[PDB]
Amino acid sequence: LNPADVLPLTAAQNAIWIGHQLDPASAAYNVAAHVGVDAALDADLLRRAFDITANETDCLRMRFVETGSAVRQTFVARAETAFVMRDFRAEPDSTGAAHAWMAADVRRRIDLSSGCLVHAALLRTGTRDYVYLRSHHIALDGFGLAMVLRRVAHVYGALVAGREPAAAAFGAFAEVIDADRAYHASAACEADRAYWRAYCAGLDDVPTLCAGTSLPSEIAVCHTAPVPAALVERLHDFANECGTHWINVVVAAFGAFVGRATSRRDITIGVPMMNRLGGVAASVPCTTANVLPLSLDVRPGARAEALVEAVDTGLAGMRRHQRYRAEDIRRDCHLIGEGRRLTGPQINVDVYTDPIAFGDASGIARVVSAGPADDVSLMIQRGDMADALTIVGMANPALYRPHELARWIERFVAFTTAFVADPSCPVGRLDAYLPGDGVEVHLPEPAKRSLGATLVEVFERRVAERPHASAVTLDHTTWDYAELDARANRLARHFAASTPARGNLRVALLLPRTLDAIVAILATLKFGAAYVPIDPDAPAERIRAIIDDCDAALVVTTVDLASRIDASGRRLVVLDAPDTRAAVAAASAAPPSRDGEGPRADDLAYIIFTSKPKGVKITHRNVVRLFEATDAWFHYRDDDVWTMCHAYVFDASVWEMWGALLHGGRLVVVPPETTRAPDALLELVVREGVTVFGQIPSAFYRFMEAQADHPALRQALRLRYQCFGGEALDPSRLKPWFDWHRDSGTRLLNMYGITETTINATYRFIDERDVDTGRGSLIGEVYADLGIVVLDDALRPVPAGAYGEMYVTGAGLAQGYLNRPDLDAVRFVANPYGPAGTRMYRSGDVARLHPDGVLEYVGRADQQVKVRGYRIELGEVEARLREYAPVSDAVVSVRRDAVGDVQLVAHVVARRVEALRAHLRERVPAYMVPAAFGTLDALPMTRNGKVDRKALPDISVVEPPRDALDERIVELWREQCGDVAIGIDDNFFDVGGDSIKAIRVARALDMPVMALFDAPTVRACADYLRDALDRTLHHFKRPAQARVHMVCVPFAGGSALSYRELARALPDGFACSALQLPGHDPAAPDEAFVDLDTTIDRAVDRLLAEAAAPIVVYGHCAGNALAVALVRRLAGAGANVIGLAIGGMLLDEDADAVLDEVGARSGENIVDFLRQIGGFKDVLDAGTLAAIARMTKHDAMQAATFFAAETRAPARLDVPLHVVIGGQDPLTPDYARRYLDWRRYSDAVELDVIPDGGHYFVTEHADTLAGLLAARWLRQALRAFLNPFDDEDEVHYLLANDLGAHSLWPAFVPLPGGWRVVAGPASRDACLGALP
Ligand SMILES: *P(=O)(O)OCC(C)(C)[C@@H](O)C(=O)NCCC(=O)NCCS
Ligand SMILES: N[C@H](C(=O)O)[C@H](O)Cc1ccc([N+](=O)[O-])cc1
Ligand SMILES: [Cl-]
């Protein structure tokens, strides 16, 4: 008893239907294709064919209607055909007009209840006639269109010759529906289901070539690249070597290309599967297509032939299970929701290879739009000639500009060409990016300055010169250099009495911070030895272990601290012991150098330990090198006075020590008691007249808090420099500092370093400009004799603006780790960029390389965490919390929730909890918002002065509603989801929310449904309603980091939407709005035009409140009238208008005459002329063209009277004017001299030109325009860093240079110049097992 006349939708239909309702203004789900042929086709018989065939089908006889409260489809008495002929043979570019038409036609939405699914055409050009068909994706997919087109072709061919056409092979779509119902009740569905549930079990944050959230709801922007024959020939060769189709090689390359561009191992490619073979759908035009994940593991170590084989099998498994809807995979895996997705970029394995023959001439079937564009999609396509291939890029026009798309295709073709060169080559040797995309790196150059060889040579140099200059100060006591030198020389003779050992030795120091410790360092260095600091408060196990690890010849301590040392047999020197005190005083004060004994430059100086603990071996050369290479920018003065605020176990102390004593300055030992009390520190620094001052950023924040409460002192300062240490800066917190010392002359010096590169590797001067721009933590540029490269997980350089790990090549590299060669081998590694046997150092710190050459420090990758769905650096979040005014500093930790995965927790310190959340949700995404906070006096200081995250107090369901609005919504979600306790902040799709249930809600709330997908929390739902609620002014983007707000006035006949293509070609430095004149929406034409002064008046009111920045008004064609009238009426309103931009207009000599000319023409005449210069080319129906003609004359009459009224001596409005004319515009002739006629409105006018642009350049050339407008008036996501040197599963070489260093190296990377293989391919543990 099943009927024939009203049928349910298939599972494929039901999904297109939903997508069609999500943006009711969108044509995105239409489909279209054409067939070019060289022949003259009969127009009347061709529509007979379309109309015959359309009735031979079923899906094209359908109209759709809602019921069941689902959606049903009903047949129609007759198949409507919409057929048009258009002859472009009279335009100069006929072929480009035809493609222009087709691109416009496919952008007209279809009313599924209309019942009109067939819009066809015959488009005649000089070479080819194009047979064109569009429809809606619900009734046809790509392969269906081609079926219908082959049938039209057959019917046509018969009709010309008066033959009877052969019977249709088309089956009935009603038994496709039974089959679909059958399958979803079968076992195969529950098999296929669990195949994908497993296959996709891991998928999280699928990669894309651009970071994007919102679901694609718009037609693609295309680019078409021919493939060179040489490459086509090589794919078939490369394919036969691997035993597969050539099309699989291309999938493999494209998959490898995504991985190599994102530097990510987990790649998921969407593949449309035809899903027709094997069943009844083969013969029936319909939509069965399914876009499914292809997961590849793109290892930098993987050979090309291997990935091609992964594709071969992955697709094989896809084709087995392909009947299971990908939309249901996505619902099952909870990948529908906030920015979540199943498939990434797409490519097709189904190419239309069969020429379709209309009469005596064949053509190729080419597809204009198959669906909404998600990230990037490639479509393989053939040519009219045999063995010819072409790529068609298709992208989401919201995320990708047309030149950005062309670039990826250009990059890709070159990558493919390299990919098929050697099947045995690993992809990790291949670069996705082209040379133009890279940034020049600083190559190490020698430093032309010289001080000396060792530290003692250069220090002794300074005692000769100025022996009575002051050296060190502790509390009230001060010593000149000569006394300091003598005291050290005396203690260094005592060392030589107290051990027989000689050579480069190691002397452990357990000491308080006092002058004994300064003397003991110098003594150690004078004696030919290296100092090994230990903190007197260290745990006794660590003292024990350091001493044994360095095999101390001597241990130098005090009477009180000697009790912290075992009786192990080590020799001690106790400085404050009265007998030892005297034994040294009686010693000769002559230098050991006077006897010919001292360190060499390559001998060690100190060994500092990091966190088991690892010791770092530094040389005299390393340290003096630092200062030799920094004199250029830093300019060391002998009258500087430095500050030692940092423990001697931390290499800051080496910097702030030898900064004075190499150069002639006086060092101030700051007791640790006063360093942790920021007020007295400020007392002490001014009192003692300090110049150079080091601090760790978290400490400096506590320091300004003291500068606040004591203005007496802060204006008494005299600092040549203010320096920043081994954390990252958050310049946002520096606002109050420039409010004080902007004119003091004190610079701000930021220095990135790490203990393995000799204290510091980079410098930036922080000025008043870059505090509030917020470009991130900026570490500046590399020291002269160092170098830094930023590399991907394959050890290749990353392009401009991309994450990577920093590798420090240079001469500040430590000799290595103490007794850990295995660390020397995986940390200090062979250097491909540089001289033969040199080596590079893994920082493990993440960085971006910006195109100008500055480095942005992003964070240490060890500590990068992952919350639900997202990887986040804790340092970007700790910054977001310092923006909130009372927040001074903060720290974020992590903990494991209940019986759950992960959550964030923050500890903030005040200056002078729920208000923080509010400010935060307006700032950051919901995923960054810590779970719960805590109030703390200060932050746990670490032994070396950093934030101790291991001591933080541990501070251990979902949040309820707020106002009556919220609960009003919550019960509505239960209506759909049921009685499941939901939280205000919960996600709708995780709590049982269905894809359809979300339309029912956003209906009930009268809100766009895309809003809810992109943000499925009832908080965002409420906040959308109350915080938002006849719109005179249309906003495109109002970003937060916006300097300039561009308000745009449309041309004649245009709406505000004509600036959209500009608004998203404009950098995010700009905010862009357009004012919508009434009656100018061709969709709602039935309101009434208004005059100038009214529009201008109602546009200041909304615009004084809604302006996001200083305004720059843009005008085009007749909009320039309303533009100048705007800047003028703003200027008087007490508004921030800084300028005006004038497109496509020159002032007219006789304004009285244009006004008499315009009033004498019909709008229908004005528009027909604008259409011949290339306007309104996308308007294909007479009804809306009529509407536009009416607007056109209004806008023209209004502009003409305006410029007629105010004459040749206007009211001078006095701003700068940016005049932009297109060089092909017939309405701006003789522009070279005539632009100057705009001087009438102000003194400063400058011209820009777009030579190949015409009058409508604001649309066609928009990219070029934003380039101009930004010149004058003015990202991917965070990935996982998998370092190949740490990759257990790969194979490794162990290398050697001639001078005895060893390095681990991955097999897949080519060998560096000066390095030799000591151990054949093996595992990581094996290779490290082979070092002697
Ligand atoms: P809901 O879970 O159904 O999500 C809405 C959706 C728009 C994401 C979903 O309906 C969908 O993916 N529709 C697209 C259908 C489609 O594009 N078919 C073409 C396959 S070749
Ligand atoms: N190597 C250390 C680390 O590994 O974190 C720091 O980066 C070094 C440092 C340099 C300069 C200053 N300072 O204050 O001038 C403090 C700290
Ligand atoms: Cl290791």
Author numbering: 4 to 72, 77 to 618, 623 to 923, 929 to 972, 978 to 1050, 1059 to 1303, 1313 to 1370
Question: Which text from the study accompanies this structure?
Answer:
Obafluorin is an N-acyl-α-amino-β-lactone with broad spectrum antimicrobial activity.
To continue our studies of NRPS systems, we obtained an X-ray crystal structure (3.0 Å) of holo-ObiF1. The most striking difference of the ObiF1 structure and previous examples of NRPS modules is that the N-terminal portion of the terminal MLP domain is threaded through the interface formed between the A and C domains to associate with and activate the A domain. Salt-bridging interactions occur between Asp1324 (MLP domain) and Arg853 (A domain) and between Arg1317 (MLP domain) and Asp804 (A domain). Surprisingly, the C-terminal MLP binds to the upstream A domain of ObiF1 through the archetypical MLP-A domain interaction. This interaction motif comprises two MLP tryptophan residues (Trp1343 and Trp1353) that form a pocket around an A domain alanine (Ala841). The ObiF1 structure is unique as the C-terminal MLP domain serves to ‘anchor’ the TE domain to the core of the module. The ObiF1 A domain adopts the adenylate-forming conformation. The specificity-conferring residues of ObiF1 form the hydrophobic pocket for the p-NO2-phenyl group of the substrate and make no interactions with the polar or charged functional groups along the substrate backbone. We observed a hydrogen bonding network of the catalytic triad at residues Cys1146, His1284, and Asp1254.
